[PDB]
């Protein structure tokens, strides 16, 4: 009976809530009340990178910590050498409304996507000397929101028709599809060992997915509005979520609960990006307040402010060797901080 | 500008009345005090807003900031001049300050007139046809530099004269005759005609044509409630400009035309009253150019 | 990729000539070009360099003011015009491709060259030996020496290694002292330090016989070495 | 029978999520702080480096 | 030395500048309609040239780009409103089928009152204007709309009623205006009408830049 199934679902939800409420024997706010505060952290601009003609929506650090890629509404991707402020390649597009970009871990390919429902893969190492399109993946019914690489052969995408998928580049079709959300998905992030990943999807909920089986193992809830950014901790055992009601949160995957909430009484705007530092002590956030804030990750206070922009901060990133933080805003400029 | 004679140096009866009378001793201080008080803070505030509260360097901001600077530097030294008129045309502060006043007064007025002409041309150019900021900086520097090369001759000729019969030393109200027919004649008539009439024609032409094109029956009805307002903010500016300045320069010309030909100087009182009229623009300009707007006023009040 | 040159032959003293090179199979407008020369039975020497956008032009000492270089992009052709030739110009000429961006591989394709017959702050390089007898199946090592340190402040070292089989144009083996070019079997290696350089071949085979060359690219003019020949 | 299928899928997902081991929050917090401490000396943004090893200046 | 790489960058920069002079002269129009709103015939008759479609053309030496969204406008989230650079919004609406009007009418109130579109213009095209001529002498508007206060056989009265109904749902009456027109198969003066409305909007902006307001 449908009523029997619904009652069983209610009983299962009660059991799950009771199990979660059983294990909260303390809190991080009390166990870490004896750590010397970090003190004021001030950073200055080291470079400014000019050359775009419109808003900037994405950026990604290459794996050597020196080259980076960016995508704007002009219809262009640009590859920058960060040490000396040059340009390596300028790639035109077939579609002007773009919303994501990625850099392959080996340094050969890049990816691009947007409102055309198609994900394009470009090849940079060629005999003839130019940059030519290598693959076009189609099969989603909505727009793409984020895309990441696993190797030079497999790619993972998330689309705005409530689904995520894993594509095989050599052949050109789907291998596994993940379904289970109600609204559209906005961001996903990959595990350090490339065995799991997480997604946030405008239901005030986030999910953990396995890549070799195709099933979800855990669903977290707690926010009040949309989720716009997500990232892992360097360990691989915690992740930080950013929402649209001026609030960040830190969740754990083994206790299956929520650990910290970062919020302040002077902040009444949304969040556009979240990233971590190498040792796991700092958390960075970009706001619509035209600035970036720097939080301590174990005390929940404020450490500092980076305030060099005159418009919304849309993109944020930290290197793999931990030397610089890069920001991109709707004023058509990127900046590097150290 | 009254002529003096040959050092024994003496003046006639009419001048003896004018310098010792009521027009030059009581009337002027009221006017100059009002102009000082209203003028200084307002143009200062405009300068601060235009320099520190503008995000987009639209050329109108550049030109209006320069005009505000011009009026501000025009108004400041007036305490010494008002001290002069309250002492009874006597002076105690060395020739350098006399030189400074006479140069700065004229330099500042003509800076004001030049930047008004520039603003008119910019408005017509933008409306008629739907880099300018760079050219604005270039033209600002050009005009300033030109002015600095035509304000010099006022310092290099002694501006103060002694008169025993009154036992009074005066600053630029009395001068020796042999200078009036020579260099000063060329300098003043050149300032009167060269730097007033041609820009006046340019401004009049630009505004009249702009009106003719905004009033035509060849554009959409839905804009009407705006366009007519835009008419009333041109007519009130243009008609002010010609009635505040023109009654000065014309009389000046007439004045000298009786010195280079006849040798009487009985039209000085008319020049004094016209100069009173032409000094009020440093106060009446920010109320008709700046404050009648919805954006500048809000930025200034929130600044 | 394919480059074919033409315009050579025989001339009497005096006179003047012109050489052209035609390109196919790549983006000619994005590359720089070099003209390289070889004596009848001796080492290599460098003749001219023309760059992208036709903005920078470099000539050598025994060339300057007597030769001219030019390019035409829409027709994809490269020209060298020569005036008042002498006896020491009898030689065979090669055209070489180049590019410069972070991570690139300069000198990655060589033409097939033409024959022409006619009836000091420079950095010097020294090749150790003129010949080395070798045995199939055994490893070999060669070395060359320089007159300055090639380790610039930014961590790079600019030394190059080329190979020439009997009867064809050379092909690149090693660039920047530690890197392998595309198409080279994974048995060649190189190493060294400031002012000493060595190259190593493990497990020789057939078709590995020829003459080996080491190049510098720290500042113009570029200088070559005498060459080592392995006799199989 | 669409509602039955949806309810059954939801029930199966809840059942699969139900049978998972858990640990206390204190152990997780201790582990997180230990990792954060043990790598403190290698973090250039938290602990700045001398100007000789800064590649950007 | 390999500082020649710097030269490469310079060349790239130059090309970007040769696009900038063009980008500032482009005008964008966002087109919205319906299944029976005659979008296909309207696009076909202008002699122009699966996700978002674009069309690029020119009128009297001014470049126009028209963006067509093919039914995806059901997306109701903020991040799909990334069209904050357009200059006008163009509705096509069918005035023949009375029953559907409310449907189409509903859509209006959702897309016009949004906050990203506070400083853009609206152009309205009521279509066919001959099926109305046929129906008005046959069928009564009052069976569907009860507020028609005139005589339901005169075309002028009913047209005034329709345009009033559409105007009534735009709040904030005056930032930039709402235009309206009637057309069946003109296919020839449409460019002129769109051009006039865009030029009027540009004047609305210029009179604010010069502080003459």
Numbering used by the authors:
A (entry chain B): 3 to 340
B (entry chain R): 37 to 42, 57 to 180, 186 to 358
C (entry chain E): 2 to 120, 136 to 248
D (entry chain G): 6 to 62
E (entry chain A): 8 to 56, 67 to 230
Reproduce text from the manuscript describing this model.
Protease-activated receptor 2 (PAR2) is a transmembrane receptor that is irreversibly activated by proteolytic cleavage of its N-terminus via extracellular proteases, resulting in the release of the tethered ligand (TL), which binds to and activates the receptor. PAR2 plays a pivotal role in the inflammatory response and pain sensation and is a promising drug target for treating arthritis, asthma, and neuronal pain. Combining functional assays with structural analysis, our study revealed that TL forms a parallel β-sheet with the extracellular loop 2 of PAR2 to engage the receptor. The binding of TL triggers a conformational rearrangement in the transmembrane core, releasing the inhibitory ion lock and allowing receptor activation.
For the PAR2/Gq complex, a miniGαs/q19 construct, which contains the crucial Gq sequence for receptor engagement, was utilized, whereas for the PAR2/G13 complex, a miniGαi/1320 construct containing the N-terminal region of Gαi2 (residues 1–15) was employed. Additionally, a single-chain variable fragment (scFv16)21 targeting the N-terminus of Gαi was incorporated into the assembly of the PAR2/miniGαi/13 complex, and Nb35 was used in the PAR2/miniGs/q complex to introduce additional features for cryo-EM determination and enhance stability, as outlined in the Materials and Methods section. The structures of the PAR2/Gq and PAR2/G13 complexes were elucidated through single-particle analysis by cryo-EM, and resolutions of 3.25 Å and 3.2 Å, respectively, were achieved by the gold-standard criterion of Fourier shell correlation (FSC) = 0.143. Because the overall density distribution of the receptor is slightly better in the PAR2/G13 complex than in the PAR2/Gq complex, particularly in the extracellular region, we used the receptor of the PAR2/G13 complex as a model to study the TL/receptor interaction. TL occupies the orthosteric pocket of PAR2 and adopts a β-strand conformation to interact with residues 227–231 of extracellular loop 2 (ECL2). Conversely, the engagement of PAR2/G13 is predominantly driven by hydrophobic interactions in two patches. The first patch is on the TM6, TM5 and TM3 side; specifically, L224G.H5.20 and L229G.H5.25 form hydrophobic interactions with L2886.36, M2655.61, I1773.54 and V3477.56. The second patch is on the TM7, H8, TM1 and TM2 side, where M228G.H5.24 notably inserts into a hydrophobic pocket formed by residues F3467.55, F3518.50, F1001.57, A1102.39 and M1142.43. We speculated that the hydrophobic interaction between M228G.H5.24 and the hydrophobic pocket, termed the “methionine pocket”, is the key determinant of the G13 selectivity of PAR2. The binding poses of TL in the Gq and G13 complexes are very similar, with minor differences noted: (1) the carboxyl group of D62N-term faces TL in the G13 complex but turns away in the Gq complex; and (2) the side chain of I39TL3 faces D62N-term in the G13 complex but turns away in the Gq complex.
